[PDB]
């Protein structure tokens, strides 16, 4: 028969949504069924540069970013993308005090 062993390139855990406050460290995570491929980053279209805050990881099959201290403006829906392929997730920064305190 067919029985595919082999790993076809495929987004089967799509960006995840992240909602949280400033100052914590953001971790969005991706599953890109390749072992240990790099992706471009995108964030609101924009290629996103670990610098600062921003961390790009990559794990066997999930890719992560990192984003220490977010801020408001670390949001813009994040896309991580392998040429082909691609996905996509909004970062949410909540935040303040109300329902965003102690």
Known sequence: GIDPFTIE?????????????????????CQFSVP?????????????????????????????????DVRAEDQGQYTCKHEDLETSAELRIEKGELRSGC
């Open 9 to 29: 390139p495929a987004w089967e855990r799509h960006l995840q949504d992240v909602t949280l406050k400033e100052g914590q460290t953001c971790t969005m995570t």
């Open 36 to 68: 240990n491929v790099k992706s471009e980053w995108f964030r609101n279209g924009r290629v996103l540069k670990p610098q600062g805050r921003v961390k790009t990881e990559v794990e066997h099959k999930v890719h992560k970013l990192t984003i220490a």
